[PDB]
Design a protein around this nucleic acid. Structure first.
Ligand SMILES: [Mg+2]
Ligand SMILES: [Mg+2]
Ligand SMILES: [Mg+2]
Ligand SMILES: [Mg+2]
Ligand SMILES: [Mg+2]
Ligand SMILES: [Mg+2]
Ligand SMILES: [Mg+2]
Ligand SMILES: [Mg+2]
Ligand SMILES: [Mg+2]
Ligand SMILES: [Mg+2]
Ligand SMILES: [Mg+2]
Ligand SMILES: [Mg+2]
Ligand SMILES: [Mg+2]
Ligand SMILES: [Mg+2]
Ligand SMILES: [Mg+2]
Ligand SMILES: [Mg+2]
Ligand SMILES: [Mg+2]
Ligand SMILES: [Mg+2]
Ligand SMILES: [Mg+2]
Ligand SMILES: [Mg+2]
Ligand SMILES: [Mg+2]
Ligand SMILES: [Mg+2]
Ligand SMILES: [Mg+2]
Ligand SMILES: [Mg+2]
Ligand SMILES: [Mg+2]
Ligand SMILES: [Mg+2]
Ligand SMILES: [Mg+2]
Ligand SMILES: [Mg+2]
Ligand SMILES: [Mg+2]
Ligand SMILES: [Mg+2]
Ligand SMILES: [Mg+2]
Ligand SMILES: [Mg+2]
Ligand SMILES: [Mg+2]
Ligand SMILES: [Mg+2]
Ligand SMILES: [Mg+2]
Ligand SMILES: [Mg+2]
Ligand SMILES: [Mg+2]
Ligand SMILES: [Mg+2]
Ligand SMILES: [Mg+2]
Ligand SMILES: [Mg+2]
Ligand SMILES: [Mg+2]
Ligand SMILES: [Mg+2]
Ligand SMILES: [Mg+2]
Ligand SMILES: [Mg+2]
Ligand SMILES: [Mg+2]
Ligand SMILES: [Mg+2]
Ligand SMILES: [Mg+2]
Ligand SMILES: [Mg+2]
Ligand SMILES: [Mg+2]
Ligand SMILES: [Mg+2]
Ligand SMILES: [Mg+2]
Ligand SMILES: [Mg+2]
Ligand SMILES: [Mg+2]
Ligand SMILES: [Mg+2]
Ligand SMILES: [Mg+2]
Ligand SMILES: [Mg+2]
Ligand SMILES: [Mg+2]
Ligand SMILES: [Mg+2]
Ligand SMILES: [Mg+2]
Ligand SMILES: [Mg+2]
Ligand SMILES: [Mg+2]
Ligand SMILES: [Mg+2]
Ligand SMILES: [Mg+2]
Ligand SMILES: [Mg+2]
Ligand SMILES: [Mg+2]
Ligand SMILES: [Mg+2]
Ligand SMILES: [Mg+2]
Ligand SMILES: [Mg+2]
Ligand SMILES: [Mg+2]
Ligand SMILES: [Mg+2]
Ligand SMILES: [Mg+2]
Ligand SMILES: [Mg+2]
Ligand SMILES: [Mg+2]
Ligand SMILES: [Mg+2]
Ligand SMILES: [Mg+2]
Ligand SMILES: [Mg+2]
Ligand SMILES: [Mg+2]
Ligand SMILES: [Mg+2]
Ligand SMILES: [Mg+2]
Ligand SMILES: [Mg+2]
Ligand SMILES: [Mg+2]
Ligand SMILES: [Mg+2]
Ligand SMILES: [Mg+2]
Ligand SMILES: [Mg+2]
Ligand SMILES: [Mg+2]
Ligand SMILES: [Mg+2]
Ligand SMILES: [Mg+2]
Ligand SMILES: [Mg+2]
Ligand SMILES: [Mg+2]
Ligand SMILES: [Mg+2]
Ligand SMILES: [Mg+2]
Ligand SMILES: [Mg+2]
Ligand SMILES: [Mg+2]
Ligand SMILES: [Mg+2]
Ligand SMILES: [Mg+2]
Ligand SMILES: [Mg+2]
Ligand SMILES: [Mg+2]
Ligand SMILES: [Mg+2]
Ligand SMILES: [Mg+2]
Ligand SMILES: [Mg+2]
Ligand SMILES: [Mg+2]
Ligand SMILES: [Mg+2]
Ligand SMILES: [Mg+2]
Ligand SMILES: [Mg+2]
Ligand SMILES: [Mg+2]
Ligand SMILES: [Mg+2]
Ligand SMILES: [Mg+2]
Ligand SMILES: [Mg+2]
Ligand SMILES: [Mg+2]
Ligand SMILES: [Mg+2]
Ligand SMILES: [Mg+2]
Ligand SMILES: [Mg+2]
Ligand SMILES: [Mg+2]
Ligand SMILES: [Mg+2]
Ligand SMILES: [Mg+2]
Ligand SMILES: [Mg+2]
Ligand SMILES: [Mg+2]
Ligand SMILES: [Mg+2]
Ligand SMILES: [Mg+2]
Ligand SMILES: [Mg+2]
Ligand SMILES: [Mg+2]
Ligand SMILES: [Mg+2]
Ligand SMILES: [Mg+2]
Ligand SMILES: [Mg+2]
Ligand SMILES: [Mg+2]
Ligand SMILES: [Mg+2]
Ligand SMILES: [Mg+2]
Ligand SMILES: [Mg+2]
Ligand SMILES: [Mg+2]
Ligand SMILES: [Mg+2]
Ligand SMILES: [Mg+2]
Ligand SMILES: [Mg+2]
Ligand SMILES: [Mg+2]
Ligand SMILES: [Mg+2]
Ligand SMILES: [Mg+2]
Ligand SMILES: [Mg+2]
Ligand SMILES: [Mg+2]
Ligand SMILES: [Mg+2]
Ligand SMILES: [Mg+2]
Ligand SMILES: [Mg+2]
Ligand SMILES: [Mg+2]
Ligand SMILES: [Mg+2]
Ligand SMILES: [Mg+2]
Ligand SMILES: [Mg+2]
Ligand SMILES: [Mg+2]
Ligand SMILES: [Mg+2]
Ligand SMILES: [Mg+2]
Ligand SMILES: [Mg+2]
Ligand SMILES: [Mg+2]
Ligand SMILES: [Mg+2]
Ligand SMILES: [Mg+2]
Ligand SMILES: [Mg+2]
Ligand SMILES: [Mg+2]
Ligand SMILES: [Mg+2]
Ligand SMILES: [Mg+2]
Ligand SMILES: [Mg+2]
Ligand SMILES: [Mg+2]
Ligand SMILES: [Mg+2]
Ligand SMILES: [Mg+2]
Ligand SMILES: [Mg+2]
Ligand SMILES: [Mg+2]
Ligand SMILES: [Mg+2]
Ligand SMILES: [Mg+2]
Ligand SMILES: [Mg+2]
Ligand SMILES: [Mg+2]
Ligand SMILES: [Mg+2]
Lengths: 138, 124
RNA sequence: UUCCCGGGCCUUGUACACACCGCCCGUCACGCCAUGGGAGCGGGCUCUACCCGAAGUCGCCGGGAGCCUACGGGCAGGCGCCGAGGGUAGGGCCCGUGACUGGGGCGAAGUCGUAACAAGGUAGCUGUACCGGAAGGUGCGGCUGGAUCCUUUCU
RNA sequence: GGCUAAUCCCCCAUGUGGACCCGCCCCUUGGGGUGUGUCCAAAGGGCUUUGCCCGCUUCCGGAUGGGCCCGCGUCCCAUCAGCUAGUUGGUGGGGUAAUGGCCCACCAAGGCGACGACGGGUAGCCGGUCUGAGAGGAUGGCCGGCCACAGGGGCACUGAGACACGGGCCCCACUCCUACGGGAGGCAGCAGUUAGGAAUCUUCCGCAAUGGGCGCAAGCCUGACGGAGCGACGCCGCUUGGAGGAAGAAGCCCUUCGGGGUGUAAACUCCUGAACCCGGGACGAAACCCCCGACGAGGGGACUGACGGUACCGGGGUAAUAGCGCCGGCCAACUCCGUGCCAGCAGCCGCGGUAAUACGGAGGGCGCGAGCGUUACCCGGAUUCACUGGGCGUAAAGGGCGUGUAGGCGGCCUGGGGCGUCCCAUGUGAAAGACCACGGCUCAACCGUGGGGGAGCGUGGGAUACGCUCAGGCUAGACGGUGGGAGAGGGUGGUGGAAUUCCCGGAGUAGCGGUGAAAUGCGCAGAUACCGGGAGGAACGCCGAUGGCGAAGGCAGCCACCUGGUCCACCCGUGACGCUGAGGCGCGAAAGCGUGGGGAGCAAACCGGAUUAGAUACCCGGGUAGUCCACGCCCUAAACGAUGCGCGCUAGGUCUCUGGGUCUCCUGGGGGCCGAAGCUAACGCGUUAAGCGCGCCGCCUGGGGAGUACGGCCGCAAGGC
C-alpha cells in the first residue's frame, strides 16, 4: 500500500526533477492538490493539472528548471533544490505560531497545514495561526 | 532505530569508571608506606623508578609513584597520595606528594617548585 | 630453456613494509595485576511458623474484695486485644575472611614445535564430533572470505 | 494526714444564639432554611471605681495557618516476572476536625502487572544552579518553599495546634552516679572539645536596629538576629610608584670575538604621596513613652547604639611586597652548559642509549599576577546513545526462516463531532536568581526600584487542514471467481537400470593391489582379469544449465495417488478487509543423543605400512561409531546476497526461464550481466539499489579479557539461549 501519500508526492517530484523531466503524474487528492497550489503560487512548479490514467485520476506536476549551463555538466540549476517532509505518520509535528521556522533565512518555505487551511510560513505568521508542519522546500 | 523504537527503548546514557579509587572521591588521601622500592619500566623504556606500596586511610592499598630526584622515604613513612599514572609502569595509578607529611621536597631544585614541593631559595 | 644462480617485464595472492634471513600461533618454564569457584568460619538484615512480651490506647470487670459519692457515677486495681522487642526452626539478602583451587591477561624472555599469512608447502574458515596436555589432525555438512590450467625446519 | 485563695473545678438560672434526633422546604454527596422535643453558656481584674480600660461566654462572618483527596510529572537493574489476606470490594460499626480497610466483625472473591506490577540498588524534592549554539547533560551547598528526622525502636498524654529537638512512659546501645538497692543523661541549637578526614571558624560583641514570646504598661526574655573575629574559599575594587634618563655602566648570558642580549631596566634627576601620625567624626533612629486633642485622627514634642571613635571629611607624610606556571607538537615562548637507556620527564603522541629547544640548572622568552599551579568531580568538546543529530554488503551492527498476539503505522470522496492540533481571553506560573532600564554605597562586587519575559496546568470562547473518531460512498491496495501454465516444493506407496561389495558356478595361472617410490594386505584353501546366476544396501550417469522450485533449511531415476506455494489472461465478485510485528508457536543443514531396525560403499576413533630429525599428520592397507530407516530429542552454522519485510518512485543495453499477445516485436512474472541519475571510505551498488522516499521489526556503540564468569531458562546428555 502507499503509506505517506504526501511524502510520496514530494518524492515523485524530487526524483522527477533530478532526472530533469518535464512533468510527472502524482495520483491525486485534494490535500495534494492544495500542497501543489501553494507550490505553483510560490514559483516551484510550473503548475499542475488534473488528468485521468486508465480511468484513475492524477495530477501532472509540470516542472521548472534553470537555464542550460557552462563547461562540463550543462544540467541547469534546480528550482526545487530541496524538498522534504517533516511531519510524517509515526512522527507527527505541530508548530505553535511562534514556532513557525525561518527556512533558508527566508528564501525557502514551509507548507503548514492549519485549521485555517494550508499556507506557507509567512502566510501563517501574517495569518497568525499554527499547524502541522508539512514540509520545507527551497 | 524508528521513533516508535526510541519511545519503546530509548537511548542508553553512558556510565564511566573512576580511574582512581583514592575512593572517597577525595582530592588526596593520606597513607603509610609499606614497601619503598624501584621498578623496571614497560617495553619502550629502561630505568629505575622509585615507588611505594601504601596503606591508605580509605581501607585501600596501592603502589604510588615517588616523583622528583632525591627521595627520603622508607618503610614507615606516612605520605599523601595524588593520582595520575605512570604510563610505562605496571599498577602505579597515583603519585606521592613531596613536601607533605614525611615526604620532603626535592632539594637543590630551582625550577618547577610548586610541583616537587620545594620552598624558594633566598638571595643576597 | 625443464633444472641451478643472478636479473628484466606484465600479471596474481598476502596478515610482510628494517619488507619471506618477513610475520606470526600455541605449550611448558618463570616474573606480575585481577577474577571466578570455594568448604566451613565471623557477622549485618529480612521472611515465614510457633512461643515470651515492656509502655500505651482501647475494650470488659470493677464484686458485703478497697477509696470518693449528691447512689446517678468516678478513681484505684484486675483481666483481655493490639503491640516495640526477645527466644526457637528453615529460605534468601549483602559485607568481611578464607583452606581449595579455574583459567585469565599482559610482562624479563628462555623451551620445543610450525598451525595461520604467498597454492604458507595437505587451500582456508566453519557448526559439530572423536582424538591428540602443543599449535592441531581427522570425520560429516557448509562457506569462498581460495590460488593456478612424497616430502624438505629455523634465522 | 491536715489548712486555704483564685480568671482552677463543679451545680442551678437566663437562651441572643448553638448542638443533636424526627418532620417539611429549598439545595444537591454531610450546602441552607424551618418547626417541635432534648441538651448547652460565662470571671473576674485595674483605674481617678457612677464610667472607662483590661479580660470572660454562646454565636455569625472575615483573615491567616493547616488536614485530607484527585490528574499529571518525578533515577538505575528485567541477569527482579509475576505480586497480593486488610489483600480488593461490600453491609454494619469504632475512630477523627474530617473522607477513607484508617480500624473491627460479618459477607463476596476480588485488586495489581511487560503501559514494567513485585523485588533489589541509589536518593530528601523544588525554586534554581553549572555546562551547553541549542536540544540536552550534571546537580539541588548558601538564600526561599515543602518534607522528614532530633542516640535507635515503639507509644501516647496535654493542647487550637504535637504524637512534641532543649515535655512525658517503655525497650535497646553507650557515658556518668551508685550505700548495689537503684538513679541521671541526649549540641543534627550558638560557640567549644574530641574522634574520623584531604578539609571546614570565635567557648567574642550587642538587644541599638529588625523580628518573636508574654505584659495595660513600664518591661523582662530571644546564640532569631544585627555586628565583629578567623581562613586569598569566591567575587569586586585597590597598591607595590609616575615622568625624564645611555645609541645604552657593571655583573650574568650567548657569541661567527666584529658583536648580540638583559634594557629605559637600574644608578641618578625630579613630582605625586600606600602605609602611618594629628584633629573632626556619622547615617543606621523614631517609634514604644511625653504632653495638647478624647489613650482615635491630627498636631506638635523630648529619650534610645553593639558595630565604633569604625566608615568618612580636613590636615600632615614615607618610593613604598612579587609571585607562580610554563617555552617538542596540540600551544604563546630557544638558546648554552651539565647528565649519556642513567638520573629523570610524561595528559596523549612520546623524549633520555654523547652535539637533548622534551631530563637538571642557567640566560633569555611566553602566560597570568596576590596569586599561580596540582589533584578530584561535573558539563563541554562527544554529531561518541545521534529528539535537534549516528549507524548495520566487506569497518561494530539484519534476528537461520516463517506464522502471527499485543503494539506501531494506514488509499480516494463526503458529512457529523471537535479528542489531538491551532488561536484569543483570563486565572496560575510566590520571592530571590536570570533579562532590560534607572538608581544607592567615590567604582565595581553588592544592594534597591521598576519593567519585561516564561514552558506548563485551570476556566471560557473560537478554527477544522491535517491526526483521531462516528455515519455514508468508492475501487486504484488486499482478497475472491473463472480459464490456462511451469516447476529436483512437501508427504506416501510402488518400481528401473548402471556400479560396488558379497555368495555360487564355469573357465583360467601367478600374481594382484597400492605409491614419489615402497611396504603393510590379499593370492596354490587358486586370487586378480573373464563369463553366467543370486543376495543385499545406498545413491541416481546422460538430460544438467551460466536452469528450475521453496519462507528458510533445502529439493534430481521413473510411476501413481495425497498436497502446498506461485505466474499469466479475462476485469466477473467483496469493498481498505491493509503493512509490520516485541512475546508466543512451528520449521530448521551436518554432526550429535535415545529406542528399535539396517549395514553395500564410505568412513571419526582405532589397528597397521610408510615418510620424516620425530609422524601422533598428510600417503598406503584395514576398521568402529556413524553414514541409511521409524519414532522421539538436540536448535547450532561462512543457517551468506556476510545485504530484515512491505509499498511507491527514478535511462537504457544484453542473456535467459516461464505465461499472454495483433509473436522485426510488445507485455506480465523469475534468474544474470553491463551501465542513467544517484549512492558509496573505497570496492562496489545501480527498476533483482547498497538510489530517492514512507511504515514497522531486529541489531550496533574501541580491542583483548569472552560468547568467558555469575544468575536464570531450556536439554537425557552433549550442550543451547
Ligand atoms: Mg494550475
Ligand atoms: Mg524533525
Ligand atoms: Mg629501550
Ligand atoms: Mg630465476
Ligand atoms: Mg624491457
Ligand atoms: Mg586469498
Ligand atoms: Mg599489493
Ligand atoms: Mg622486519
Ligand atoms: Mg620461506
Ligand atoms: Mg613462546
Ligand atoms: Mg588468587
Ligand atoms: Mg500476645
Ligand atoms: Mg497492658
Ligand atoms: Mg477489644
Ligand atoms: Mg461502683
Ligand atoms: Mg484500668
Ligand atoms: Mg500477638
Ligand atoms: Mg604453517
Ligand atoms: Mg592447516
Ligand atoms: Mg596450508
Ligand atoms: Mg607442512
Ligand atoms: Mg593432501
Ligand atoms: Mg587423527
Ligand atoms: Mg573438520
Ligand atoms: Mg569439507
Ligand atoms: Mg578464503
Ligand atoms: Mg622459533
Ligand atoms: Mg490531702
Ligand atoms: Mg498533701
Ligand atoms: Mg471555667
Ligand atoms: Mg444551664
Ligand atoms: Mg433561639
Ligand atoms: Mg436540616
Ligand atoms: Mg428549639
Ligand atoms: Mg459563677
Ligand atoms: Mg470562625
Ligand atoms: Mg485548603
Ligand atoms: Mg504520580
Ligand atoms: Mg495480614
Ligand atoms: Mg480482618
Ligand atoms: Mg465506614
Ligand atoms: Mg498503565
Ligand atoms: Mg539517603
Ligand atoms: Mg540527589
Ligand atoms: Mg548559558
Ligand atoms: Mg554539541
Ligand atoms: Mg550530547
Ligand atoms: Mg533536572
Ligand atoms: Mg534531580
Ligand atoms: Mg537542602
Ligand atoms: Mg534550603
Ligand atoms: Mg505545601
Ligand atoms: Mg526516628
Ligand atoms: Mg549525635
Ligand atoms: Mg525516636
Ligand atoms: Mg493553648
Ligand atoms: Mg488531635
Ligand atoms: Mg516528630
Ligand atoms: Mg539539645
Ligand atoms: Mg526523667
Ligand atoms: Mg585528625
Ligand atoms: Mg561566620
Ligand atoms: Mg530588640
Ligand atoms: Mg500603668
Ligand atoms: Mg534567659
Ligand atoms: Mg549572625
Ligand atoms: Mg593555601
Ligand atoms: Mg583581585
Ligand atoms: Mg620611569
Ligand atoms: Mg652591559
Ligand atoms: Mg612632598
Ligand atoms: Mg535620625
Ligand atoms: Mg542615628
Ligand atoms: Mg521624636
Ligand atoms: Mg489628658
Ligand atoms: Mg500622632
Ligand atoms: Mg509625632
Ligand atoms: Mg526601647
Ligand atoms: Mg563609640
Ligand atoms: Mg589623607
Ligand atoms: Mg596633601
Ligand atoms: Mg624604588
Ligand atoms: Mg609553539
Ligand atoms: Mg617538566
Ligand atoms: Mg657531555
Ligand atoms: Mg646538551
Ligand atoms: Mg641524540
Ligand atoms: Mg632544554
Ligand atoms: Mg615539555
Ligand atoms: Mg627544561
Ligand atoms: Mg627565567
Ligand atoms: Mg585556584
Ligand atoms: Mg566529558
Ligand atoms: Mg536520529
Ligand atoms: Mg526536541
Ligand atoms: Mg557510526
Ligand atoms: Mg573480517
Ligand atoms: Mg561485520
Ligand atoms: Mg539473514
Ligand atoms: Mg549474523
Ligand atoms: Mg507477517
Ligand atoms: Mg493490529
Ligand atoms: Mg489518511
Ligand atoms: Mg478541542
Ligand atoms: Mg497564561
Ligand atoms: Mg520571578
Ligand atoms: Mg538578592
Ligand atoms: Mg541581583
Ligand atoms: Mg552607580
Ligand atoms: Mg480550552
Ligand atoms: Mg465544523
Ligand atoms: Mg471533518
Ligand atoms: Mg464548527
Ligand atoms: Mg488506529
Ligand atoms: Mg467505509
Ligand atoms: Mg465493482
Ligand atoms: Mg485457477
Ligand atoms: Mg519434486
Ligand atoms: Mg547388481
Ligand atoms: Mg569362484
Ligand atoms: Mg574350478
Ligand atoms: Mg601370504
Ligand atoms: Mg597362506
Ligand atoms: Mg596346491
Ligand atoms: Mg593362509
Ligand atoms: Mg555378476
Ligand atoms: Mg548382506
Ligand atoms: Mg537387485
Ligand atoms: Mg551436471
Ligand atoms: Mg546452499
Ligand atoms: Mg500443485
Ligand atoms: Mg487464457
Ligand atoms: Mg469490477
Ligand atoms: Mg459494489
Ligand atoms: Mg517470531
Ligand atoms: Mg535440527
Ligand atoms: Mg543427522
Ligand atoms: Mg557419543
Ligand atoms: Mg542414532
Ligand atoms: Mg542404533
Ligand atoms: Mg575403506
Ligand atoms: Mg584410511
Ligand atoms: Mg599410523
Ligand atoms: Mg624434515
Ligand atoms: Mg610409524
Ligand atoms: Mg553407540
Ligand atoms: Mg529424526
Ligand atoms: Mg533498513
Ligand atoms: Mg509467446
Ligand atoms: Mg525465487
Ligand atoms: Mg525481469
Ligand atoms: Mg535485466
Ligand atoms: Mg552494474
Ligand atoms: Mg556515475
Ligand atoms: Mg545514504
Ligand atoms: Mg525497493
Ligand atoms: Mg550502505
Ligand atoms: Mg548480542
Ligand atoms: Mg573494553
Ligand atoms: Mg566486548
Ligand atoms: Mg557456543
Ligand atoms: Mg549475576
Ligand atoms: Mg549457565
Ligand atoms: Mg536438568
Ligand atoms: Mg560448544
Ligand atoms: Mg551443564
Amino acid at each position: 500500500m502507499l503509506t505517506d501519500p504526501i511524502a510520496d508526492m514530494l518524492t515523485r517530484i524530487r526524483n522527477a526533477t533530478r532526472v530533469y523531466k518535464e512533468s510527472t503524474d502524482v495520483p491525486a487528492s485534494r490535500f495534494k492538490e492544495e500542497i501543489l497550489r501553494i507550490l505553483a503560487r510560490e514559483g516551484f512548479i510550473k503548475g499542475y493539472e488534473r488528468v485521468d490514467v486508465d480511468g484513475k485520476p492524477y495530477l501532472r506536476v509540470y516542472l521548472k528548471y534553470g537555464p542550460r549551463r557552462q563547461g562540463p555538466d550543462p544540467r541547469p540549476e534546480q528550482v526545487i533544490h530541496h524538498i522534504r517532509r517533516i511531519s510524517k505518520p509515526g512522527r507527527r509535528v505541530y508548530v505553535g505560531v511562534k514556532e513557525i521556522p525561518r527556512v533558508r533565512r527566508g528564501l525557502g518555505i514551509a507548507i503548514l497545514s492549519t485549521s485555517k487551511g494550508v499556507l506557507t510560513d509567512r502566510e501563517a505568521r501574517k495569518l497568525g495561526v499554527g499547524g502541522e508542519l508539512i514540509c520545507e522546500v527551497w | 532505530p524508528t521513533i516508535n523504537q526510541l519511545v519503546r527503548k530509548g537511548r542508553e546514557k553512558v556510565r564511566k569508571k573512576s580511574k582512581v579509587p583514592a575512593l572517597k572521591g577525595a582530592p588526596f588521601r593520606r597513607g603509610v608506606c609499606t614497601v619503598v622500592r624501584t621498578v623496571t619500566p614497560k617495553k619502550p623504556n629502561s630505568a629505575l623508578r622509585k615507588v611505594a606500596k601504601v596503606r591508605l586511610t580509605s581501607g585501600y592499598e596501592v603502589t604510588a609513584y615517588i616523583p622528583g630526584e632525591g627521595h627520603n622515604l622508607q618503610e614507615h613513612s606516612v605520605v599523601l597520595i595524588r593520582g595520575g599514572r605512570v604510563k610505562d609502569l605496571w599498577g602505579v595509578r597515583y603519585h606521592i606528594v613531596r613536601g607533605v607529611y614525611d615526604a620532603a621536597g626535592v632539594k637543590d631544585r630551582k625550577k618547577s617548585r610548586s610541583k616537587y614541593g620545594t620552598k624558594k631559595p633566598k638571595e643576597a
